[PDB]
Amino acid sequence: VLKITDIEVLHLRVPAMDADCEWGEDAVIVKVHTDKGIVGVGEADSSPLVVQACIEAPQTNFYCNGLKRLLIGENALEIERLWNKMYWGSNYMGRRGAGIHAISAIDIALWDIAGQFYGVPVHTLLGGKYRDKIRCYGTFIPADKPEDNVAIVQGLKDQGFSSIKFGGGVMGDDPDTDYAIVKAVREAAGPEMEVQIDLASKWHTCGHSAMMAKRLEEFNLNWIEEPVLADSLISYEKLSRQVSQKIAGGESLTTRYEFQEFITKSNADIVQPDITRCGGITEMKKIYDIAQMNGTQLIPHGFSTGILLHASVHFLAACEQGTLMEFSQSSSPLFTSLVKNQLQFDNGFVAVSDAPGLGIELDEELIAKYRVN
Amino acid sequence: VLKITDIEVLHLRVPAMDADCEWGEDAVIVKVHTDKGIVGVGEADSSPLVVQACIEAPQTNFYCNGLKRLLIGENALEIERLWNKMYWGSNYMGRRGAGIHAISAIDIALWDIAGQFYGVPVHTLLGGKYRDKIRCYGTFIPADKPEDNVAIVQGLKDQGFSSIKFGGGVMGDDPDTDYAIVKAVREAAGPEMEVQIDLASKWHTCGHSAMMAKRLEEFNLNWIEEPVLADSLISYEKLSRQVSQKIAGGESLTTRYEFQEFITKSNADIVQPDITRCGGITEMKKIYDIAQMNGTQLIPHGFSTGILLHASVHFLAACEQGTLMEFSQSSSPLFTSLVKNQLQFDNGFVAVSDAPGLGIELDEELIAKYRVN
Amino acid sequence: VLKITDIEVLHLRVPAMDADCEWGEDAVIVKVHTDKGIVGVGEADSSPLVVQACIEAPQTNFYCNGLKRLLIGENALEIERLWNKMYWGSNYMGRRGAGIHAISAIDIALWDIAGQFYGVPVHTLLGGKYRDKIRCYGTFIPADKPEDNVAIVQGLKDQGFSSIKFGGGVMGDDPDTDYAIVKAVREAAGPEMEVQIDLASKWHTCGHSAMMAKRLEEFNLNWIEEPVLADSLISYEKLSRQVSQKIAGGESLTTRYEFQEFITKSNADIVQPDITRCGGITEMKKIYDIAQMNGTQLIPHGFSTGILLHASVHFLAACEQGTLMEFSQSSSPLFTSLVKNQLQFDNGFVAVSDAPGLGIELDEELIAKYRVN
Amino acid sequence: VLKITDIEVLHLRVPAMDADCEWGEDAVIVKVHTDKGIVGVGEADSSPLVVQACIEAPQTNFYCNGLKRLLIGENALEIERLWNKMYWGSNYMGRRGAGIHAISAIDIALWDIAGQFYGVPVHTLLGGKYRDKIRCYGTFIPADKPEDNVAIVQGLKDQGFSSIKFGGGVMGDDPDTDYAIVKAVREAAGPEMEVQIDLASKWHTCGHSAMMAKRLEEFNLNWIEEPVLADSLISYEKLSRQVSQKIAGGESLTTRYEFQEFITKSNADIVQPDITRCGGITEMKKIYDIAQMNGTQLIPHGFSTGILLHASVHFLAACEQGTLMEFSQSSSPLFTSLVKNQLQFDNGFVAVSDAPGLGIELDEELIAKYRVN
Ligand SMILES: [Mg+2]
Ligand SMILES: [Mg+2]
Ligand SMILES: [Mg+2]
Ligand SMILES: [Mg+2]
């Protein structure tokens, strides 16, 4: 039987431990080692220090063990049983939130392991591939001055993007400033392009979100992502009845339970689990099933490294409705270079890899360079 | 204009990191330091390494800061605004679970500070005390042999306990054993005593749960605690339609959002937030209001140190319906001795402290002896 | 301990006791006296004679005591416990309506007392301030002839108001007269200004309200306040499904219970408790929490004296979503001059006061002048 | 063309203003005077000072007039239009609570006038009498010692009471005492008697309430009255799903709106409007219709003077299901002697009066003796 022999956690960071940090300038990656010398790689988009503690923690009580402790000596191929072992065994400190992000990383690595052991791409183990490539949308953080975004938008257009998302930075702060940035990007993109917006909850309330949506209705937005916090399922529901554009959310949620509540109560058009936060590939499978039962489109969230990319691609290839992925752009060495043989965006699409497991080879020299721990 | 100058996390432990650990043999306490020399003390009943990481974490992104970074230089008196700053600022890594445990500890410390600063017990800041002492119930892990339990029951009877709870260990596993443990405890306690069971999710399904509910209807139990996992709200509701006894749960939940769902969808009679997990005193207050609006009894959960105890007593004293508290006991030096002037169980009841803040003086010798960090 | 020693009720009136009276030409204010010589000031926007009787009443039965009787000798700092004491103790004559207005006045004065005793502004005790000033909207009673409102609107525009509300007088009487007044104010204000209307229930029925709303839809009204009586929650709900503009109501309601029913059943966009009617600052806190849970915007109602103003400002400063206040305009000496150091509207905003308690000094000479009792 | 010329409020009292007072030692009665010499009598079971203020109040605003000002010069026969004029005209200070108590008194007086004017008993104006007498139940405050109660039960048995209610005093406080009081009363009355309890909200929560419901299932109580406060409709509904006995409440509510909510959301078996609080005879009629539509039994609440008694009998006589009335007794001269020709309890029953109006002649000597104003 294939036995787990070690779990290795690697904190990677680009700026200083006291300095500021954007999305994608740090990472936490896990290597699961087995007795046959198959290593699986996963990651979590979460706080690296916290994820590390969830994995490396000792026993606190019978329902509170660090994840490494529960998994050394275990049968790596039995992925779902191990998911349930980690979930129960770390339940006191996990169950929702950071502990589930830790589980996601390990689960992803276990799927990598199984694919390599069995000699098949993960998409085969998930049921088989429906497509040889996946359509992407590109994302950017918008420039403070509205008309300075034309250069960014045009830069994505000749890259081949037929769909774009923007938000963060100073997005949501001024109704007039919000209007002027959305103006300058639709004009720069033309009337064929899909344009969607992400507020990262910055419109705060239901009323401010609805007023802003009718004013931006002329620009024909494809969706409006996280106008408010996903805590208020009532606020989402109420926005759905009163807005014309699609509503998207869900990226910060963890486990099938939170997704089941979101999907059925928010009346969102689009649900966006992150494969490295939600519980991993195993959990994402169950979340997809719930979405399908409810007529909700699942478009995964994610921007970290090639590990998230390879996991998300393998997952979507295996979905009948896996027709759209987020492909975010960064100059960070962690995004561009950590995975040596990284899948590349190419004229509107990313190709599906058929290599065993997740098809990940890590840049070992780069690990040595940015290793905090 | 009291400013926060430092947040000091103390990991305490009795056995070694590689060794076995039960409820109460480790703790994570937080000291919040101000520029006027007053210190506030809080704790989190969770994994000490994870809570430490939540507090000490650097910036990862705009919604992902460790708590300490968000709080140095802030006005300590502005407790609810600071709760929201932490909730928002750590949202990506927190929101539910481990991050909220870390928030709970700090929140508790901030209340302790405000009390000292204002020269009044926390119960006055919470609205004023309804009682001079609080009725307690006692808890035990039952011995494997059913006939061995008569000495533990009697031991609690000698202390003055009019109400007792048992669970954990071999409770839950075998239905015949379960019956044999419940047999010996009602007989040893007599018909006078309130007797409650806590299965810690070990009956697994409502089908297995409902069978024992008709079986032990002759033993007249006060409540049945966590028959299944609180993840299945439907399983709880279904139990409430066919069970004679009262249903209790909720100890592992975090934020008013999880409690609002549990309270309204589970039809449980009793909700059990832990003050050191749910979000702290600030959040506990909101959870109390929701419980009141829905006719649900709030009996807090908690067993760690005198910190949890002092916070729970100050809370319940200020609640119109704050009429019952868990008083679990251990010989563990972290429970008995960390808080110097610790409130004592006394013939059925724990007295309400009127000292300013939470009335907590820490055994500084003991801290040095048992600190891991 | 800080003990209540007296409760002093002052009926102030501008015109004769047999003459007509507009909004703001009479007031009832309460002074709560303590043994440390701290006086707290509150008021109720209600009938002065009735409020006075609720406070000064003797015992009628065990659940029917005047409020003064329940509070002399009590511990003033224990505000929420005293709220519950008054609520239970006056339940037979109070519970809803005028008795709750009486409670509001006292509760406001108790918060004033606590702030002074502790040496902090009330906004600190409510959780801390989110903003140094609060955006206001101005209100006026419209002139009978439509085009005579231009002078009023322009008068508010150079005052700095970016948002205006009008109603009362002859508002709601004629569909053509209603249309012509709304015409002449939007033209006078321009297309940038927020313009909202208040009918004070004068459209009577659901059908008349809906027909009038589509005809005024061109003028882009920010909200429609109280089209019908808030008794018919069904009428509000039905209007929400069929109207484009925001629906506001709630000003006449009392206690969390009426607000919970309104908020959840009316599907109103905006809920408007009056801090001097709803149960006071204590109750308003619980009403805010309910609004937040349901995605409903809370915009306080109020126009009486500086006492209501100072209470509402302290409250909103302490709300994460306290972004808008009603600032009504009157020439009445009670509005302009009763509070000596009154906060002033200044170019679109009112500044937040940091003085201890509510920051209220009463014009004692003015009290002597208009004192009926 | 009968015109109202005066409304005369009479505050009556037995002990002094500073002294103790129980149910029935004060009253507030209203005389409505017409220009044709006929006088109508009503009362309000509420605080006499507050009801007086509600009636005698000046104008405060357009929706805030004292009732007397709204009614002088009006056509007394137009009772329902006058109810609506008062409801609307005092809405700001009334709407629920004390203002509706003041309306109730006047409404009752107007019915008394119409009856005299038309030469027919009020029961004819209400639709016509179904019965010549009404079955009564009797009430007592139980003596502290459980064994002392056997003489009171027997005392009521001697009078002819086939149905009895007890509560107040020390009822509610201690569960063992509660059981010991209920023990002695079923035994003293025998199995024949209908026995009911009224806790006056003193069981506080449904958890405490439901335990006694299984406990006293052997005593076969006719109903359990107001176990908790009627504010928590959810608490009532939850009690109805698990209680053997019938649930009663509603005595403190005002207007068809509160009753509609209580009746439909509480799942109570019995609703108890007080004719002198709920809105008067006019409103009671509407509340009866709602109760009928929902299968809810209406048993009126009331203990004050012969005014309440004469109004309640005239009401119930005209109801198809007006088959049970509360007949509480006191030695108090306001109860026994204010109404000269007072209807008498007679061997189980109170006879129906056919005199025009309410058949009320007031003891004018007694008025002079006990008037406060
Ligand atoms: Mg997003
Ligand atoms: Mg438990
Ligand atoms: Mg209004
Ligand atoms: Mg009663």
Structure report:
Chains A, B, C, D: Mg(2+) binds at residues 198, 225, 251. This is part of a larger assembly, with 4 copies of chain A (373 residues). With 373 residues, chain A is an alpha/beta fold. Chain A folds into 2 domains: 1-119, 2-Layer Sandwich (Enolase-like, domain 1); 120-373, Enolase-like C-terminal domain (TIM Barrel), CATH 3.20.20. Helices cover 38% and strands 17% of the residues of chain A. Chain A contains 14 helices and 13 strands. Chain A has helices spanning 48-56, 67-71, 79-89, 98-118, 122-125, 150-157, 175-189, 206-215, 233-242, 255-265, 280-294, 306-317, 333-337, 364-370; strands at residues 4-13, 26-34, 39-44, 133-140, 163-167, 194-198, 223-225, 246-249, 270-271, 297-298, 325-328, 345-346, 349-351. In chain A, the strands form 2 sheets. In chain A, strands 4, 5, 6, 7, 8, 9, 10, 11, 12 and 13 form a 10-stranded mixed β-sheet that branches. In chain A, strands 1-2-3 form a 3-stranded antiparallel β-sheet. In chain A, strand 7, helix 9 (233-242) and strand 8 form a beta-alpha-beta unit. In chain A, helix 1 packs across helix 4 and helix 8 (206-215) packs parallel to helix 9 (233-242). Chains A and B meet through helix 1, helix 4 and helix 10 of A and helix 1, helix 4 and helix 10 of B. Residues 198, 225-226, 251, 301 of chain D line the site of one magnesium ion.
